[PDB]
Amino acid sequence: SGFRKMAFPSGKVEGCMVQVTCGTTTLNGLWLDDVVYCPRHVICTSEDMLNPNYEDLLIRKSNHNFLVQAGNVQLRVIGHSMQNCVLKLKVDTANPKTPKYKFVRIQPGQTFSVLACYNGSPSGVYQCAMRPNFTIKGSFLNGSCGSVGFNIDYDCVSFCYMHHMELPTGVHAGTDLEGNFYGPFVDRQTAQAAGTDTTITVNVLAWLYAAVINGDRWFLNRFTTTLNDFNLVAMKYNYEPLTQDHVDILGPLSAQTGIAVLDMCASLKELLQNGMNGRTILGSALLEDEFTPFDVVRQCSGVT
Amino acid sequence: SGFRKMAFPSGKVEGCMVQVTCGTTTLNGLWLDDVVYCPRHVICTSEDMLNPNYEDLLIRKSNHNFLVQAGNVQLRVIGHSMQNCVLKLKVDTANPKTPKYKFVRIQPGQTFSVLACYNGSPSGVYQCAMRPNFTIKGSFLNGSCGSVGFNIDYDCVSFCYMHHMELPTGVHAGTDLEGNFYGPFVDRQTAQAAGTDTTITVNVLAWLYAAVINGDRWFLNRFTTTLNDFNLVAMKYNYEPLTQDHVDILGPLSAQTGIAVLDMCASLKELLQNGMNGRTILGSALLEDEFTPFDVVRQCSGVT
Numbered sequence: 001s002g003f004r005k006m007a008f009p010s011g012k013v014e015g016c017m018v019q020v021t022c023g024t025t026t027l028n029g030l031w032l033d034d035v036v037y038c039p040r041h042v043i044c045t046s047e048d049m050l051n052p053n054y055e056d057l058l059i060r061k062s063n064h065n066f067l068v069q070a071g072n073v074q075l076r077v078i079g080h081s082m083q084n085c086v087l088k089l090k091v092d093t094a095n096p097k098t099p100k101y102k103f104v105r106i107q108p109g110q111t112f113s114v115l116a117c118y119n120g121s122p123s124g125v126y127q128c129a130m131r132p133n134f135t136i137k138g139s140f141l142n143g144s145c146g147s148v149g150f151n152i153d154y155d156c157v158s159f160c161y162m163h164h165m166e167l168p169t170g171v172h173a174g175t176d177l178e179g180n181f182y183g184p185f186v187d188r189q190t191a192q193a194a195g196t197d198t199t200i201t202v203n204v205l206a207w208l209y210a211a212v213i214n215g216d217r218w219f220l221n222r223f224t225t226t227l228n229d230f231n232l233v234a235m236k237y238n239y240e241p242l243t244q245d246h247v248d249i250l251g252p253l254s255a256q257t258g259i260a261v262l263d264m265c266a267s268l269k270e271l272l273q274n275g276m277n278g279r280t281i282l283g284s285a286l287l288e289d290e291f292t293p294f295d296v297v298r299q300c301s302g303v304t
Numbered sequence: 305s306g307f308r309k310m311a312f313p314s315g316k317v318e319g320c321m322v323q324v325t326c327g328t329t330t331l332n333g334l335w336l337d338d339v340v341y342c343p344r345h346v347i348c349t350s351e352d353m354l355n356p357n358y359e360d361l362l363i364r365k366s367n368h369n370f371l372v373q374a375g376n377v378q379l380r381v382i383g384h385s386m387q388n389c390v391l392k393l394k395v396d397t398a399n400p401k402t403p404k405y406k407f408v409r410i411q412p413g414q415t416f417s418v419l420a421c422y423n424g425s426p427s428g429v430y431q432c433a434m435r436p437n438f439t440i441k442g443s444f445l446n447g448s449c450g451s452v453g454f455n456i457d458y459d460c461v462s463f464c465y466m467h468h469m470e471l472p473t474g475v476h477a478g479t480d481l482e483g484n485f486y487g488p489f490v491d492r493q494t495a496q497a498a499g500t501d502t503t504i505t506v507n508v509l510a511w512l513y514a515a516v517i518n519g520d521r522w523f524l525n526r527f528t529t530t531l532n533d534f535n536l537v538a539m540k541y542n543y544e545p546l547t548q549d550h551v552d553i554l555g556p557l558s559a560q561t562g563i564a565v566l567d568m569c570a571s572l573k574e575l576l577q578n579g580m581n582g583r584t585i586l587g588s589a590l591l592e593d594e595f596t597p598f599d600v601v602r603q604c605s606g607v608t
C-alpha cells in the first residue's frame with residue numbers, strides 16, 4: 001500500500017544521453033543505434049531565436065561542427081539532417097547501450113517520465129502528464145533542452161517527448177522524436193498562446209480508485225450520477241468531458257473495488273461542488289490528474 | 305523554471321538489483337562488489353513472522369539455500385551472515401555494474417530516492433523523506449522488500465535505506481544498509497507504534513523559497529517574526545521547532561531571493577494560521593515538506 005507519483009526507472013534512458021554542441025550552444029541529445037537526436041535550435045545563437053530560418057542556419061553547418069560527446073568519448077559525425085524540429089546526427093558508432101525502443105506520439109492526458117539532463121548528464125527523473133493543451137508542467141532550466149520523456153513496457157522504451165522550450169508562462173513545450181511539436185508551438189522566441197487547459201477527468205477518477213484501494217474512503221458517498229449530469233459539472237469546473245471510452249478504461253478499477261464508475265463520478269461531483277473541506281486524499285489537498293487508469297493498475301499490482 | 309518532486313536517476317542502482325529466494329520466500333537484494341544485501345526476513349515463513357528467532361532460523365540455512373539471481377544469471381553463494389536485520393550473502397563474483405558507493409545513515413527530515421523492485425526487477429522510482437518519526441510514506445507491495453533508498457553525489461551512490469515492512473497503518477519501515485532499523489521498529493508481525501509525526505519545518509521553508517524562485521509569490525507578506533514567536537506557531541501546528549542550524553542551512557536560499565529567513569517564517573506563520581484560502585503553491589494545495597534546502601538549490605541550479 002501507499003501511492004506515489006512514480007517515474008519509470010531511468011537506467012535505459014541514461015545510457016542514451018549525450019551532449020551536443022554546435023558553435024556556442026550546448027544541449028542534450030539522445031543516442032539510439034548510430035543516430036543522435038536533439039532539438040534543432042542547437043544551431044541557433046541568441047539573436048537567431050527571435051525568427052530563425054532553420055534551413056538557412058543548418059546550411060552553414062557541416063558534420064564537424066556538431067560536437068557529440070558521450071561522457072568522455074567523442075562521437076564522429078558522418079551525417080546530419082533536419083526532420084521537423086529535430087536534428088538527426090548520424091554517428092559512425094552504434095550506442096552499445098541502445099535499449100529496445102520505439103518512437104511514439106502520446107495523446108494529451110497520457111503520462112510519461114522525464115529524465116532531466118544538463119550537458120548530457122542526468123540530474124533527475126520525474127513523472128508528468130501531457131496536458132490537454134499539449135504543454136507539460138515540468139522542471140527544466142537552460143541546458144535541459146534535448147531531455148526526453150518516455151514510458152517503459154518491460155524491456156522496450158517508448159520515447160514520446162523531447163524538451164525544446166519554456167513558454168513565457170513557465171510551462172514546457174516540446175516535440176515527439178520525429179520533431180513534431182505537441183500543440184501549436186513553434187521553436188521561435190515569440191509570445192505563444194498555450195490553449196485553455198482542462199483537468200484530465202479519467203485520471204482524477206483513476207486516482208480516486210487508487211485512494212479507495214489504499215484506504216482513503218472518506219469521499220465515497222450514497223449517490224450516483226449519469227454521464228450527462230456529471231459532464232454538466234465537468235463543464236462548470238473545466239474538467240474534460242467523460243465518455244464511454246473513459247468509463248471502459250476505468251473498468252478494471254471498477255471491477256477491483258466494486259464501485260461502479262458512475263458512483264465514483266458522483267463522489268467526484270460532490271468533491272468538485274464542495275471541495276475537500278480541509279481534508280486530504282493520498283496526501284494531496286487537490287484532485288490529482290497525472291495518474292492514468294493504467295498507471296494506477298500498474299502501481300497497485302507491482303508491474304516491473 | 306517549474307518545480308517537481310524529482311528522484312535521482314536510478315541507473316546506478318538498477319545495475320545492483322538482484323532477486324533473493326530462500327525456501328518459499330522471494331524478495332530483492334542489493335549486489336555491491338561480491339556481497340548481496342537483503343532483509344533477513346527472507347529466511348522466514350508466514351508462521352515464523354509472528355515471533356521469529358532469526359538466529360535459530362538462519363542456522364537451518366546453508367549457502368546453497370539462498371538463491372540469488374541477477375536477471376537471468378545465477379550467483380554462487382559462498383558465505384552468509386546476519387548483521388542486525390540484514391543478511392549479507394557473499395557471492396563468488398563481484399558485480400561488474402557496482403558503482404562508487406557508501407552506506408550512510410540519514411537523519412530524519414532528509415530526503416532520498418527509492419527504486420521500488422519486485423523479483424529483482426525495478427518497477428519505478430520516487431522521491432521521499434524519512435519522516436521525523438522514522439517511517440517513510442512510500443509505495444510498496446508484497447515482494448518490494450529489499451528495495452533501497454539512496455542519494456547520488458555525481459558518481460557516488462549513498463545507500464541510506466532498505467525496505468523491510470509495512471506497518472498496520474500503511475506506512476513503511478526499514479533499515480540502513482548495516483541492518484539497523486530507522487525508528488523503534490522490529491522485523492516482527494506485531495502491532496508497532498510509529499511515533500507522533502511532525503512536519504519538517506526547514507523543508508517547508510525551503511519549498512517556500514523554491515516557490516518564490518519559480519514565480520509563486522502570493523503568500524509573501526509585510527510581516528516578520530522571531531524564532532521564539534514562530535516556534536510557538538510551529539508547536540500549535542505540529543511543526544518541528546526551527547533552530548539557528550535550520551536558519552543557517554536556508555542561508556543560500558535567503559541570499560538568492562533576498563527574503564530574510566524570519567520574513568519567510570512570517571509567511572509560513574500566516575499560511576499555518578489562515579490556510580491557503582483555496583489557492584495553490586507550486587501546484588500543491590498543502591504545505592510540502594519533502595524537499596530539503598539542498599534539494600531546492602540542486603533542482604533550481606541543475607546539478608547533475
Ligand SMILES: Cc1ccncc1NC(=O)CC(C)(C)c1ccccc1
Nearest residue numbers: 140141142164165166187188189305
Ligand atoms: C531557460 C529554459 C528553461 C527550460 N526550457 C528551455 C529553456 N530555454 C529556452 O526555451 C530558450 C531556447 C533558446 C532554447 C528557445 C527554444 C525555442 C523557442 C524559444 C527559445
Ligand SMILES: Cc1ccncc1NC(=O)CC(C)(C)c1ccccc1
Nearest residue numbers: 001444445446468469470491492493
Ligand atoms: C505487504 C507489504 C507491503 C510493503 N512492504 C512490506 C510488505 N509486507 C510485510 O511487511 C510482511 C513481512 C513478512 C515482509 C514482514 C516483515 C517485517 C515485519 C512483519 C512482516
